[PDB]
Amino acid sequence: LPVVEIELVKPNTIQLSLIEHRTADTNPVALPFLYKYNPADGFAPILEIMEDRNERIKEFYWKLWFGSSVPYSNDINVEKAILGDEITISSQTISEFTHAIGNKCDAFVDRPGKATLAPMDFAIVIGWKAIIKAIFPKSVDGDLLKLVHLSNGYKMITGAAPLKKGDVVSTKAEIKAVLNQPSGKLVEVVGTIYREGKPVMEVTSQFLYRGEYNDYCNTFQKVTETPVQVAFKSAKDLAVLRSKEWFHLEKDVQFDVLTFRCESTYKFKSANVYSSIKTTGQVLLELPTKEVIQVGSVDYEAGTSYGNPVTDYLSRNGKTIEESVIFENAIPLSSGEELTSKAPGTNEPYAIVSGDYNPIHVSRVFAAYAKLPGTITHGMYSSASIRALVEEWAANNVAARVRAFKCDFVGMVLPNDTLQTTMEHVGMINGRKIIKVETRNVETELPVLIGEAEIEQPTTTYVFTGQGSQEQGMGMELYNSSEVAREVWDKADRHFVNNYGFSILDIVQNNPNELTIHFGGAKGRAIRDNYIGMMFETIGEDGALKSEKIFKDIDETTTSYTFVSPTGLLSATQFTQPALTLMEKAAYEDIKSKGLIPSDIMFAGHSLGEYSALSSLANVMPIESLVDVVFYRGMTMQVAVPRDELGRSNYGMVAVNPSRVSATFDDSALRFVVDEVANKTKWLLEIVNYNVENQQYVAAGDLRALDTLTNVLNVLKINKIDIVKLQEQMSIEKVKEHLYEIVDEVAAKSLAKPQPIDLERGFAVIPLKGISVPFHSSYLMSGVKPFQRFLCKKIPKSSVKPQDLIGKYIPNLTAKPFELTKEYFQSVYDLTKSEKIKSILDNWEQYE
């Protein structure tokens, strides 16, 4: 076919017609060039008519990328965003595209019983005819032919669903950067792709009208600033910025630290003078209720400046809220040569799929006109290739894990070239993995693609330990090494000593056996009043809500009070569980400081880690409230049991291994055993811990029933007569008496020892040494109302951000994930017979 036509036109003018065929409709289109013939000079007989050249090139490219359908309209506003067009993502298009890029990721090939997924790189297919319309406007006038695609960047909106094969998808894109660099006219466009109105992902492309341009009038730039966090400590600082006429606060509230989220709008007048700067942004204040309220606005505006003063002032006087936390030493993901790819043979299959008919990649003649090495591969193809590479070599072929990918077309690749890439994990952000890549032309070793990808972590979950694992020196290495961790021990103890009169750090570090609180001068009295104010409830036989005192030993006369724990204060419940929640929250916060937390995490805690959990992941409470509730809980469950002269109880707790008794001893075995041994002796005995099936059960109750049971489990082991093995030997009722033939003989032994019976280790029973309160049992059910009061006044209702609790939180009361469905209220209320939840459950309709 004709690809080149040189012919005379109206006298003394040559029209070099450069023809291209493979178009949207395969209709051949001509690129009319004009050259003036000059017989007068021979040294230069023909000079090209340079006037109106860019327009001839532009209309050509317009017919190319859009087809002769839409009239070439060059009058595009730069300011307004450019609209795309609603397209239906069908399975055929997905298949063709995946084949054109050679992607094998099975999430995109149609499989039964699973939703057909589309590749994230399909957005450019969706958004090309919207993206490229941004380089057409008259103000950005340059050699369209020498255009070079510099860099591309994908970014899925946090929490956006990847594409399916039925999605009705539209595209909106706006142009951001038009700046005359020394190398040419850079143009950056960002495309916010939509799905039923909600934006799904953002694509940031980057072109370059190579050459030279001095149109410093039609150049500009819009950039959002990095959110900076400035901390105000002295009193001048608050006046320092209040002097700044560009700073303008609208709320007269005191503030300690302020986060500045700003954006700017530059307009240049020369290489470095800014004909205008309009930089508006918001200043934000972090309240202890974790609710962020804007204190005021930032409004700078000037002309012929040399820098943005607001940004500079933020830089030197404050640190940014940075997200890309970098390792000190990057790690190579895979080592060897297994990361090698190869360029295609022809770029036409990619062109017809991606709608990019750029004749640089398909025709020898254009590729020669731009003096570039030949029909180089489509840059977008080279992007998608490495993307599909890392999608399996970095995410183990899990498609939804990649959430953002950006790369820089450093070099060009001619077809069929063999490309080797390296793959490196360097940093972290928001809990997702930063992976840096370099694709070098393996036969020349020069780099071609330097990129960056944000892929998720494996589905993680965080559990938090309970009490019993305490020991001296918890995290003290971390406390001495992690600043952000030290800032929670220091934030907490200086709350204790100023409100309870002891340093938790000293308790954890040098665990003593006794602590003497002193109510000294003014602030000494200002502490013992706090102790006095602690009024807990234990429902007695009268049932009256007896707002009774915890410390009957503290009054208006007691000058000083002493705690004693023979084992060590670090073992006393009211002191240990604050230490545990502190060390756990310290570790969690130090980790979060490293951007190590995925967004889709599920969390839970074992009877104490629960508090250190919803305070950590859900931040329902600041540290100062958390320590108060955990200390108050320790004391409440402590004084809840009437003690002996030594402070000890007739109650206890025991851990059992239902496997060491007999292989036939199932979960139902020991729970039926506890049911019978507690229903006969009329004592209180419950299994409160369902830790491991048939390996770890922890039962609680009065020491009498606990020893009765630790003996029934010994005699059923030496006899190997299991209650389930009696189900085929006896009926359901005559086993209830069969165990009676045994349980009385050992109840006699339970009464045969001194009533505070020191539980001896059974055959498969390992008691809880150190504690004597049957927590998680119905015995403590009386003391809940005071704790429930304490909570609803220590937990600010406004701090509850429920979106992170639904499904991500697993309570220990109700092991199914926390979620506010009517059935969930039913399940919790039938388990606790509460009043507050059944009240709202009755009038449930007040939900929608």
Partner: protein, 93 residues
């Protein structure tokens, strides 16, 4: 549910949940079977002084979720903050 309605609901529900947790048995076996089956979590990170739940999770895997992981080709990796410092911080030598 309006954000204010569900906030009231969530607040009251959480308050009562914690309050009665204090005196109701911890249902940790089924909690493990939730966060291992209903979610199929790969990395289980325990934070505390000692891996009391890591040992509490390895046994659950070896007891009830071996055929399930093999059927699904899941390589569950348990990690505790006590010993697995280099592995949780993704900066392991």
């Amino acid at each position: 549910m309006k954000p204010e309605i569900e906030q009231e609901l969530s607040h009251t529900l959480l308050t009562e949940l914690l309050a009665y947790q204090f005196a109701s048995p911890v249902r940790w076996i089924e909690t493990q079977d939730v966060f291992l089956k209903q979610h199929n979590t790969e990395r289980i990170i325990e934070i505390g002084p000692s891996p009391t739940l890591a040992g509490m999770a390895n046994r659950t895997i070896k007891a009830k979720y071996e055929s399930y992981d093999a059927a699904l080709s899941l390589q569950r990796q348990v990690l505790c903050y006590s010993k697995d410092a280099k592995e949780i911080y993704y900066k392991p030598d």
